[PDB]
Amino acid sequence: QSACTLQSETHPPLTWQKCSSGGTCTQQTGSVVIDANWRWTHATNSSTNCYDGNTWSSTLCPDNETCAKNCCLDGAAYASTYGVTTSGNSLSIDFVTQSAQKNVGARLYLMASDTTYQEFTLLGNEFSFDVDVSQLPCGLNGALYFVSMDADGGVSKYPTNTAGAKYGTGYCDSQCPRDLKFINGQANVEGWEPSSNNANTGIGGHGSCCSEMDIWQANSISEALTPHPCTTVGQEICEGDGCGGTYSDNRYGGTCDPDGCDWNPYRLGNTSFYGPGSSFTLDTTKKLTVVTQFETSGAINRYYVQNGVTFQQPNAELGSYSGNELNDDYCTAEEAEFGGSSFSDKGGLTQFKKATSGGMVLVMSLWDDYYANMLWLDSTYPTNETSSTPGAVRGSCSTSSGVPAQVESQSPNAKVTFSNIKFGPIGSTGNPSG
Amino acid sequence: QSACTLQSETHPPLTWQKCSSGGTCTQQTGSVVIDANWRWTHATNSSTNCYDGNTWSSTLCPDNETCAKNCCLDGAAYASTYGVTTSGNSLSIDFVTQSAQKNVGARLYLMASDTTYQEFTLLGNEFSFDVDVSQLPCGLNGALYFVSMDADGGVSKYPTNTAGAKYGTGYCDSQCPRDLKFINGQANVEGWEPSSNNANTGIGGHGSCCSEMDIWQANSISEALTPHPCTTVGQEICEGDGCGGTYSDNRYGGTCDPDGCDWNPYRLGNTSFYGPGSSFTLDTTKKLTVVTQFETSGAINRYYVQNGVTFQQPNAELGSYSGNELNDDYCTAEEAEFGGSSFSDKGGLTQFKKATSGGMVLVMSLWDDYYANMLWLDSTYPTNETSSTPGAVRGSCSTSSGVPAQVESQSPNAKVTFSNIKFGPIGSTGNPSG
Numbered sequence: 001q002s003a004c005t006l007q008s009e010t011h012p013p014l015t016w017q018k019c020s021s022g023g024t025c026t027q028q029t030g031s032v033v034i035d036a037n038w039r040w041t042h043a044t045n046s047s048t049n050c051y052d053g054n055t056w057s058s059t060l061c062p063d064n065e066t067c068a069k070n071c072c073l074d075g076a077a078y079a080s081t082y083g084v085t086t087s088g089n090s091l092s093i094d095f096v097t098q099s100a101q102k103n104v105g106a107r108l109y110l111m112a113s114d115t116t117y118q119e120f121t122l123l124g125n126e127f128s129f130d131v132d133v134s135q136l137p138c139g140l141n142g143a144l145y146f147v148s149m150d151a152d153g154g155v156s157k158y159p160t161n162t163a164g165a166k167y168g169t170g171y172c173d174s175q176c177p178r179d180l181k182f183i184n185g186q187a188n189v190e191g192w193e194p195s196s197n198n199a200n201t202g203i204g205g206h207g208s209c210c211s212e213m214d215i216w217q218a219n220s221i222s223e224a225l226t227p228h229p230c231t232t233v234g235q236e237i238c239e240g241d242g243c244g245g246t247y248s249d250n251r252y253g254g255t256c257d258p259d260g261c262d263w264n265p266y267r268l269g270n271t272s273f274y275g276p277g278s279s280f281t282l283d284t285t286k287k288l289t290v291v292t293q294f295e296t297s298g299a300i301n302r303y304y305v306q307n308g309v310t311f312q313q314p315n316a317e318l319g320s321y322s323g324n325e326l327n328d329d330y331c332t333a334e335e336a337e338f339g340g341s342s343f344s345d346k347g348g349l350t351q352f353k354k355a356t357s358g359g360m361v362l363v364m365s366l367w368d369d370y371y372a373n374m375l376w377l378d379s380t381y382p383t384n385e386t387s388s389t390p391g392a393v394r395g396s397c398s399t400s401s402g403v404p405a406q407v408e409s410q411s412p413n414a415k416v417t418f419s420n421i422k423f424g425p426i427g428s429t430g431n432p433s434g
Numbered sequence: 435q436s437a438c439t440l441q442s443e444t445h446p447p448l449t450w451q452k453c454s455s456g457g458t459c460t461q462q463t464g465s466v467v468i469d470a471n472w473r474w475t476h477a478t479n480s481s482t483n484c485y486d487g488n489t490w491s492s493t494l495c496p497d498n499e500t501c502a503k504n505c506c507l508d509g510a511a512y513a514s515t516y517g518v519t520t521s522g523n524s525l526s527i528d529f530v531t532q533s534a535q536k537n538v539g540a541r542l543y544l545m546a547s548d549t550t551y552q553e554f555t556l557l558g559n560e561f562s563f564d565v566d567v568s569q570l571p572c573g574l575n576g577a578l579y580f581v582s583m584d585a586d587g588g589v590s591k592y593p594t595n596t597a598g599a600k601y602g603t604g605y606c607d608s609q610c611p612r613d614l615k616f617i618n619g620q621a622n623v624e625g626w627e628p629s630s631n632n633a634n635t636g637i638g639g640h641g642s643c644c645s646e647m648d649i650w651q652a653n654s655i656s657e658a659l660t661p662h663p664c665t666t667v668g669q670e671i672c673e674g675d676g677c678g679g680t681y682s683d684n685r686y687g688g689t690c691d692p693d694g695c696d697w698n699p700y701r702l703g704n705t706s707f708y709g710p711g712s713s714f715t716l717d718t719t720k721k722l723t724v725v726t727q728f729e730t731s732g733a734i735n736r737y738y739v740q741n742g743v744t745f746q747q748p749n750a751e752l753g754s755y756s757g758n759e760l761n762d763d764y765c766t767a768e769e770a771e772f773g774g775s776s777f778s779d780k781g782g783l784t785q786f787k788k789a790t791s792g793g794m795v796l797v798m799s800l801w802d803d804y805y806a807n808m809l810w811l812d813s814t815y816p817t818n819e820t821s822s823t824p825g826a827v828r829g830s831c832s833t834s835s836g837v838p839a840q841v842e843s844q845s846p847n848a849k850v851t852f853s854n855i856k857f858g859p860i861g862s863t864g865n866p867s868g
């Protein structure tokens with residue numbers, strides 16, 4: 001797609017700290033951009049929609065190539081349309097925003113310039129942020145994560161994409177998502193099937209795969225840390241059910257691991273660690289700091305800070321594994337005890353290290369789940385299982401929770417706030433901000 | 435040996451903090467005891483010495499058994515004889531103390547009661563302490579380390595030792611030291627050879643081996659972190675040159691690894707990290723905090739704090755290894771690049787994990803080196819090598835430094851102060867003291 005300018009595009013600024021082994025941190029100035037899927041897509045020459053509700057214009061978009069030629073992405077009114085605001089080092093995303101139309105959530109990328117994404121090399125480094133999850137009930141996910149996207153959003157590879165990172169193009173993740181409207185500078189109208197339960201979305205014939213580091217998928221009830229390897233590290237198109245992932249009839253046929261090696265303290269047995277109020281180690285009614293360390297071995301370490309008190313990731317015992325580090329032994333024990341082979345089939349932490357050794361783009365999002373109602377994060381899943389099935393229970397939310405239309409109606413003012421991002425060598429991010 | 439009471443034995447008190455995963459720390463009250471080798475050893479029935487200068491009474495001690503029957507260890511005047519003092523959570527050790535006689539340094543163990551050593555299970559935990567090394571020049575070593583000693587100092591196994599932990603019996607380490615005067619409830623007079631350069635010491639026919647975790651061997655110039663595995667984890671007697679270690683003609687014949695997998699940031703190439711004054715990352719003219727984390731994988735992580743600024747162990751590149759974690763890959767790369775097979779021959783970090791999974795006793799000492807002048811810690815070693823030999827240079831001290839008689843004459847008021855010991859689960863020791 002190209003870019004149009006019937007609505008101006010001004011990325012909300014966001015600062016963050018880059019820290020050094022020598023003990024100082026210095027402020028960096030970036031901004032955030034909303035993903036292309038949230039945007040108005042219209043004809044280059046008029047205000048006629050190329051995509052409307054959950055279907056495409058059959059005349060503007062008779063095939064993927066003609067559609068991309070005929071159509072552009074336009075600018076975003078971040079606060080009034082999307083409920084996205086920033087102030088200094090803080091970003092807030094509202095759940096439901098009512099303007100001329102209803103908008104649900106947002107997916108945002110950190111920019112290095114008006115036209116390029118910021119790339120972070122995670123290996124050997126740590127990433128710290130503060131989060132307020134107090135306004136996130138069952139069924140919602142405020143997510144902070146990394147994906148192996150191109151810095152230009154795909155422009156250099158696919159010259160029919162001239163919109164680029166400035167318009168939030170080029171997304172990929174470990175689900176090989178097929179709900180994207182443009183992939184590789186072409187539309188995704190071929191094979192499009194409108195969602196049966198979502199007025200605004202559908203599933204197309206192609207998907208967009210890449211490595212995904214889920215630092216944070218969470219609400220006030222549950223939180224998870226999950227690496228997802230793929231056999232191709234960076235962004236790559238896939239076709240139909242060969243994509244695998246959430247959007248395909250077959251979840252596992254493809255190049256990415258859509259399950260990951262997840263660490264959810266509640267799932268692992270510590271049901272007292274994270275939740276609302278003072279009965280929990282970390283009280284989710286209050287802001288908390290989350291620090292994630294990517295050691296050169298490929299293992300991942302985690303600690304939290306709240307009210308100046310530090311907590312390592314809680315210890316877990318699973319099969320022969322005992323510890324608090326997300327390493328080969330954990331991931332192997334997890335597959336053995338909870339089931340599955342997707343993570344190992346895709347090369348596990350060894351393959352994942354290829355992603356963290358390269359650049360990844362920072363994503364911050366707020367979403368509800370039209371496929372599984374977020375039950376995999378905060379409930380019992382699948383819902384017929386009980387607590388006697390190892391790993392079935394992931395949080396205390398009812399298996400009836402998270403119906404999108406219900407949570408959108410009952411909790412439209414839900415929100416997440418991410419702030420005080422700091423990044424640098426392991427051991428450096430707790431030093432004074434600059 | 436038995437215990438006598440011509441001089442009273444009052445262990446200087448020392449407090450330390452035990453911290454919990456839940457974020458609180460509580461004060462523990464212990465004390466310190468001086469190692470038996472520093473004590474007066476005399477006949478049970480009189481004040482006649484069993485050991486004097488560097489030789490034994492040939493009448494009281496004609497063989498190891500008769501000697502142990504005839505002889506006792508007596509009490510220690512900690513400050514006036516040994517220059518050992520405590521105050522709250524702080525312990526100081528002076529280098530040379532002049533009383534009726536000259537004393538050099540001390541080796542001390544943390545006690546749980548008047549009659550038992552405190553045992554620490556390191557695996558899954560971290561150990562934090564503060565240290566002032568400002569008064570330690572080239573050739574000296576203020577050491578804080580752990581060894582796999584019995585809690586009773588050997589009494590239960592060797593009933594002819596009735597003195598016990600109260601009199602600092604039962605030492606062992608990864609050198610299988612043969613300078614000990616009593617081992618396994620018998621003297622070490624059989625095969626005794628007085629040191630050619632030390633008026634107070636010698637080498638006997640038996641030695642005392644066990645696993646050794648050198649958290650801290652250091653002065654104002656250099657510091658090293660070193661695990662030493664043994665094929666028998668706990669205390670075990672050895673015979674003659676079969677002992678191996680520093681005290682034997684053959685260094686490597688035995689059950690322990692006397693070299694270890696050492697991590698010295700200077701040796702690894704960062705000559706700016708640790709030293710006196712503001713040209714160094716850590717300024718050794720000032721107190722610093724040293725934190726050492728024993729992850730369940732068997733790897734060891736390290737960070738430092740000075741003036742509220744945190745520094746991870748600096749990154750090192752050695753062969754194919756890159757990182758700041760002391761792990762299997764580091765130790766293997768170290769042997770490949772610097773030479774040697776002792777660490778791996780004895781089972782490496784896997785074998786070492788058997789020590790940290792069990793109890794170990796905390797040792798704090800101050801010493802000069804009558805065998806190699808501490809050159810292995812702070813100089814170029816061996817001394818014919820140059821900086822073109824990988825790993826030869828370990829600090830900036832001259833290869834002429836550390837002659838014991840010289841440093842004892844020039845720097846008798848050298849001292850080390852260890853303080854604010856805190857111990858608990860990984861991630862817990864930076865929380866408020868109780």
Ligand SMILES: O[C@@H]1[C@@H](O)[C@H](O[C@@H]2CO[C@@H](O[C@@H]3CO[C@@H](O[C@@H]4CO[C@@H](O)[C@H](O)[C@H]4O)[C@H](O)[C@H]3O)[C@H](O)[C@H]2O)OC[C@H]1O
Nearest residue numbers: 037038039040041051052053102103104105179180200201
């Ligand atoms: O001037 C008017 C334009 O502003 C208006 O633009 C519309 C803005 O909203 C667009 O709908 C978005 C589409 O994305 C939805 O989010 C989905 C959530 O799940 C994700 O998996 C999925 O990928 C996302 O697509 C979002 O909730 C919703 O608001 C709409 O399509 C635009 O047309 O158009 C009319 C102009 O007059």
Ligand SMILES: O[C@@H]1[C@@H](O)[C@H](O[C@@H]2CO[C@@H](O[C@@H]3CO[C@@H](O[C@@H]4CO[C@@H](O)[C@H](O)[C@H]4O)[C@H](O)[C@H]3O)[C@H](O)[C@H]2O)OC[C@H]1O
Nearest residue numbers: 471472473474475485486487536537538539613614634635
């Ligand atoms: O009442 C008098 C007693 O106090 C006096 O006791 C003497 C106290 O000093 C003893 O000499 C010690 C022996 O250990 C030396 O340290 C060595 C350092 O290197 C280590 O490897 C080695 O293992 C240690 O042994 C220490 O510097 C030195 O002071 C002496 O043997 C006692 O006799 O005895 C006379 C009474 O009248």
Ligand SMILES: O=C[C@H](O)[C@@H](O)[C@@H](CO)O[C@@H]1OC[C@@H](O)[C@H](O)[C@H]1O
Nearest residue numbers: 106107143173174175214217365367
């Ligand atoms: O691991 C989770 C999964 O691979 C990703 O698809 C997930 C990460 O949070 O991404 C969200 O997918 C749904 C979409 O609505 C939202 O914008 C994404 O952040």
Ligand SMILES: O=C[C@H](O)[C@@H](O)[C@@H](CO)O[C@@H]1OC[C@@H](O)[C@H](O)[C@H]1O
Nearest residue numbers: 540541577607608609648651799801
């Ligand atoms: O790793 C070093 C070696 O294995 C140990 O012998 C060393 C640890 O610092 O121990 C010292 O050995 C010499 C003695 O004079 C001193 O008391 C010990 O702490």
Ligand SMILES: *[C@@H]1O[C@H](CO)[C@@H](O)[C@H](O)[C@H]1NC(C)=O
Nearest residue numbers: 021022704706707715748749
């Ligand atoms: C030494 O280590 C410190 C702390 O990691 C680092 O800041 C410094 O750049 C390093 N210097 C060299 C020369 O490697």
Ligand SMILES: *[C@@H]1O[C@H](CO)[C@@H](O)[C@H](O)[C@H]1NC(C)=O
Nearest residue numbers: 270272273281314315455456
């Ligand atoms: C949960 O984790 C916290 C922090 O490590 C710990 O203090 C607490 O004892 C754990 N509780 C349970 C039930 O495992």
Ligand SMILES: [Co+2]
Nearest residue numbers: 295299729733
């Ligand atoms: Co590790």
